[PDB]
Amino acid sequence: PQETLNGGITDMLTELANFEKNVSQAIHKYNAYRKAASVIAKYPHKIKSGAEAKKLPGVGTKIAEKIDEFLATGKLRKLEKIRQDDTSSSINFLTRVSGIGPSAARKFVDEGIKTLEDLRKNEDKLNHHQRIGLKYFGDFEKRIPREEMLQMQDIVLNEVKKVDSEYIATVCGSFRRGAESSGDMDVLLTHPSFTSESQPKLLHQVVEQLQKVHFITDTLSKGETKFMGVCQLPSKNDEKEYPHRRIDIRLIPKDQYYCGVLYFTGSDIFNKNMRAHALEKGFTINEYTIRPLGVTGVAGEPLPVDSEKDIFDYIQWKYREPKDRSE
DNA sequence: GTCGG
DNA sequence: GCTGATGCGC
DNA sequence: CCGACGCGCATCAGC
Ligand code: NA
Ligand code: NA
Ligand code: NA
Ligand code: NA
């Protein structure tokens, strides 16, 4: 299907989704709208009525009614109204800043802070994360072309190996599945010395080396097992500099590493299907391990996993290449 | 808002 | 000061 | 009808 097919409807549902999440603070409604937009975005036909759309899982009575209004009038009165609402449109907007969620956006708008310009004039009211989100507001909304992700991976793999050749690092996400672009860089890291029964500095050493070579430019958060920050590729001589990008690095116990790589590689639809299969096969798979299930539903100890394939073998599933994990 | 036990 | 709740992003 | 739809880190709220 193509955007122009039911783009009006999916755009409408997505906009409704955002107001539910950022203004009404109804996360489940936010996801209901997203689910509806997704199922419709995959429908290979230009919808002619709400009834037609209602046959799709995720589209109920209310969304069907909204589709009827949109099809007959080319808009939704409720959406048009909230769109022009100064307060709501501002709260919704501010959450685009990383660090500013529904609560913060609401507080800011309540005190007259509604724009980036306003945020810029009120630095003392923003925490460290929010300040970084503001500074890179534009860059963070740009996608990362695969070619750049490759350049970024080169650097990450090189520096990690440089700190300790025994580290194992894997860039996951859609990138690992072959995507032509990514929204950020997700790095999974492990070390043989680190197991579930196991140093509290394995992550630090890597983050530090990446900062030393000036790849990592800012830190949103950093703990013993998870780092979230900002990075930027070196500027091509006198050529325009690259935009700053979001990068996360997670340290995971060796014995849980591949369940992690499998999970963070996705896609989400694939994960859902694989776990479903695992269950019907007597196994339960989460991001950390795969465990057998007894005849009464009791989970046993986690099974040994030394590769993604081990996971597939357990559930009698043929190994699936990342490129083929779209679903 | 949608689904389903 | 410490402990648990909350916000946030994923 | 009516409940469902996980966790690390930064920071706050309460003691
Ligand atoms: Na439906
Ligand atoms: Na935000
Ligand atoms: Na946001
Ligand atoms: Na070595």
Q: Which domains are seen in chain A, by residue range?
A: 3-85 (1.10.150.110), 86-142 (1.10.150.20), 143-263 (3.30.460.10), 264-326 (3.30.210.10)
Within 7 Å of a protein beta carbon, the nucleotides of strand C are 6-10
C-alpha–C-alpha distance, residues A284 and A130, integer Å: 38
Per-residue three-class SS string for chain A: CCHHHHHHHHHHHHHHHHHHHHHHCCHHHHHHHHHHHHHHHCCCCCCCCHHHHHCCCCCCHHHHHHHHHHHHHCCCHHHHHHHHCHHHHHHHHHCCCCCCCHHHHHHHHHCCCCCHHHHHCCHHHCCHHHHHHHHCHHHHCCCEEHHHHHHHHHHHHHHHHHHCCCCEEEECHHHHCCCCEECCEEEEEECCCCCCCCCCCHHHHHHHHHHHCCCEEEEEEECCCEEEEEECCCCCCCCCCCCCEEEEEEECCHHHHHHHHHHHHCCHHHHHHHHHHHHHCCEEECCCCEEEECCCCCECCCCCCCCHHHHHHHCCCCCCCHHHCCC
Of A307, A184, A326, A316, the C-alpha closest to A254 is A307
- For ligand 4, the distance from its centroid to the CA atom of residue A305, given in whole angstroms, is 24
- A100 among annotated binding-site residues: yes
C-alpha–C-alpha distance, residues A140 and A230, integer Å: 9
Tokens of A296: 């009464």
C-alpha–C-alpha distance, residues A180 and A101, integer Å: 29
- For ligand 3, the distance from its centroid to the CA atom of residue A96, given in whole angstroms, is 4
**Is any atom of strand C within 7 angstroms of residue A98's beta carbon?**
yes
* A66 is known as an active-site residue: yes
C-alpha–C-alpha distance, residues A72 and A55, integer Å: 19
Question: How many CB atoms are located within 10 Å of the residue A119 CB?
Answer: 21
C-alpha–C-alpha distance, residues A302 and A14, integer Å: 39
Q: Are A167 and A184 in contact (CB under 8 A)?
A: no
Question: How many CB atoms are located within 10 Å of the residue A274 CB?
Answer: 19
C-alpha–C-alpha distance, residues A218 and A319, integer Å: 38
- For ligand 1, the distance from its centroid to the CA atom of residue A58, given in whole angstroms, is 5
The ligand with the least distance to the CA atom of A130 is 2
Tokens of A180: 């032509």
Task: Give the resolution in Å.
Answer: 2.0
Asked if the peptide bond before residue A267 counts as cis, ω within 30 degrees of 0, the response is: yes
Who's near A325: CB < 8 A, 6+ residues apart? A177, A265, A266, A267, A270
Q: Which of A21, A66, A201, A212 is catalytic?
A: A66
Nucleotide nearest to A203 (CA to C1'): D8
Q: Are A264 and A234 in contact (CB under 8 A)?
A: no
C-alpha–C-alpha distance, residues A282 and A88, integer Å: 48
Who's near A11: CB < 8 A, 6+ residues apart? none
- A173 among annotated binding-site residues: no
Who's near A272: CB < 8 A, 6+ residues apart? none
From residue A263, how far is each of A92, A167, A177, A254, A291 by CA, in Å?
Answer: 30, 20, 12, 15, 15
Nucleotide nearest to A29 (CA to C1'): B1
HSE on the CB side for A63, CA within 13 Å? Answer: 29
C-alpha–C-alpha distance, residues A84 and A248, integer Å: 36
Residue A96 bridge partners (DSSP): none
From the CA of A226, how many Å to the C1' of C9? Answer: 12
C-alpha–C-alpha distance, residues A117 and A70, integer Å: 34
From residue A189, how far is each of A52, A182, A206, A256 by CA, in Å?
Answer: 47, 19, 9, 11
Question: How many CB atoms are located within 10 Å of the residue A214 CB?
Answer: 10
What's at A167, amino acid-wise?
Y
* Gapped junctions in chain A, after residues (C–N > 2.5 Å): 198
Residue that has been written with the tokens 């989100």 in this structure: A133
- For ligand 1, the distance from its centroid to the CA atom of residue A36, given in whole angstroms, is 9
- A63 among annotated binding-site residues: no
**Both ends of chain A: CA-CA distance in Å?**
17
> What crossing angle do the helices spanning A146-163 and A202-212 adopt, rounded to 10°?
120
From the CA of A13, how many Å to the C1' of D1? Answer: 27
From the CA of A17, how many Å to the C1' of D5? Answer: 15
